[PDB]
Swiss-Prot record:
Coiled coil: none
Chain positions with N6-(2-hydroxyisobutyryl)lysine modification: K45
Location in the cell: Cell membrane; Endoplasmic reticulum membrane; Golgi apparatus membrane; Nucleus membrane
Protein name: Epidermal growth factor receptor
Subunit structure, as described in the record: Binding of the ligand triggers homo- and/or heterodimerization of the receptor triggering its autophosphorylation. Heterodimer with ERBB2. Forms a complex with CCDC88A/GIV (via SH2-like regions) and GNAI3 which leads to enhanced EGFR signaling and triggering of cell migration; binding to CCDC88A requires autophosphorylation of the EGFR C-terminal region, and ligand stimulation is required for recruitment of GNAI3 to the complex. Interacts with ERRFI1; inhibits dimerization of the kinase domain and autophosphorylation. Part of a complex with ERBB2 and either PIK3C2A or PIK3C2B.
Shown residues within the full chain: 701 to 1004 of 1210
Phosphoserine: modified positions: S289, S293
Impact after mutating E34K: Found in a lung cancer sample
Species the sequence originates in: Homo sapiens (Human)
Disorder: Lung cancer: A common malignancy affecting tissues of the lung. The most common form of lung cancer is non-small cell lung cancer (NSCLC) that can be divided into 3 major histologic subtypes: squamous cell carcinoma, adenocarcinoma, and large cell lung cancer. NSCLC is often diagnosed at an advanced stage and has a poor prognosis. Neonatal nephrocutaneous inflammatory syndrome: An autosomal recessive disorder characterized by intrauterine growth retardation, premature birth, fragile skin, recurrent skin infections and sepsis, failure to thrive, nephrocalcinosis, and nephromegaly with tubular dysfunction. Some patients have chronic diarrhea, and necrotizing enterocolitis.
Superkingdom field: Eukaryota
Gene designation per UniProt: EGFR
Length: 302
């Protein structure tokens, strides 16, 4: 039962742009609800050139609100202004793609493998709620703290019926370099096509934000995949980590790993992280943590 909370425009203060792009425009702000009188850091999303498109996103997010998973973004409510806006808790450390690019010199094995676990736990939750994301990528993972990441952006997400195993898409722009072959060829999307995208997302993290198939046009991808070519082994990845990615990119969808399997294997690896990822100076690296006495420094800076 999907309940949309409508937030008053007048309850938001110090609204400022964070960034723009394919996702539209995201702002940060302080939501002070009347009565409670407490300042809650919030992110605000809108499109600028339909109000329909963003309500579909709010529906899907409202539809999977029954259970609180810590690794998927919660809709706090919408706001009606000049445009329709989505509202969520601010993820202060921002987008994981940008984060791995900027903090490369202090990202150790433990962090990369833990992130992989947390994204698999988030997708497993969404699979249980019959949700196909259709846009899993580093750009659609956010950082609450360097130890804690959440899946976001349900603009392409589809809920499957009790009977339905797959969603057939119509003519609509889609991220080719993150999509399974059968999605490129036949516009078919399943939980197992999301596993392919999970594979690409992991490659992005292990390369500290490299562009997949860089300098290759989107029209050559299906032919490259049909020849048996895949994204290369990242320098830091031992064979077991790369084999997981290659299992995610298998032609037979049902042969690909399940998220429940990916949780367990990446969990096993997180218990001995230096065995599975080889990073120079791993033990000398550090990122801010809530347990740190001076963590309030990082939150205010970022
Ligand atoms: C769908 O969940 C949201 C809602 Cl309901 C409201 C506002 C933002 C989001 N999520 C997103 C954030 C976001 C959510 C929370 N806190 C900070 C955020 O942005 C951080 C940086 C700024 C611009 C790129 O990401 N950033 C992005 C989305 C998104 O949906 N697609 C890609 C970029
Ligand atoms: Cl693309």
């Amino acid at each position: 039962q999907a309940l949309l909370r409508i937030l008053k425009e007048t309850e938001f203060k110090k609204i400022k742009v964070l960034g723009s792009g394919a996702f539209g425009t995201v702002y940060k702000g302080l939501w002070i609800p009347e009565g409670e009188k407490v300042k809650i850091p919030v992110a605000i999303k809108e499109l600028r050139e339909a109000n329909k498109e963003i309500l579909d996103e709010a529906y899907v997010m409202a539809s999977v609100a029954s259970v609180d998973n810590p690794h998927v973004c919660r809709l706090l409510g919408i706001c009606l202004t000049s445009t329709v806006q989505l509202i969520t808790q601010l993820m202060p450390f921002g987008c994981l793609l940008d984060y791995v690019r900027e903090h490369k010199d202090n990202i150790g094995s433990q962090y990369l493998l833990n992130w992989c676990v947390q994204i698999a736990k988030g997708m497993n939750y969404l699979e249980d709620r019959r949700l196909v994301h259709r846009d899993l990528a580093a750009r659609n993972v956010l950082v609450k703290t360097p130890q804690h990441v959440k899946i976001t952006d349900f603009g392409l997400a589809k809920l499957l019926g009790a009977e339905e195993k797959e969603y057939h898409a119509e003519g609509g722009k889609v991220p080719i370099k993150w999509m399974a072959l059968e999605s490129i060829l036949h516009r078919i999307y399943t939980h197992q096509s999301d596993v392919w995208s999970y594979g690409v997302t992991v490659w992005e993290l292990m390369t500290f934000g490299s562009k997949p198939y860089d300098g290759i046009p989107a029209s050559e991808i299906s032919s490259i995949l049909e020849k048996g070519e895949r994204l290369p082994q990242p320098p830091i990845c031992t064979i077991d980590v790369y084999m997981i990615m290659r299992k995610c990119w298998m032609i037979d969808a049902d042969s690909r790993p399940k998220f429940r399997e990916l949780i367990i294997e990446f969990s096993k690896m997180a218990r001995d992280p230096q065995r599975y990822l080889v990073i120079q100076g791993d033990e000398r690296m550090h990122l801010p943590s809530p347990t740190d006495s001076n963590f309030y420094r990082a939150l205010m800076d970022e």
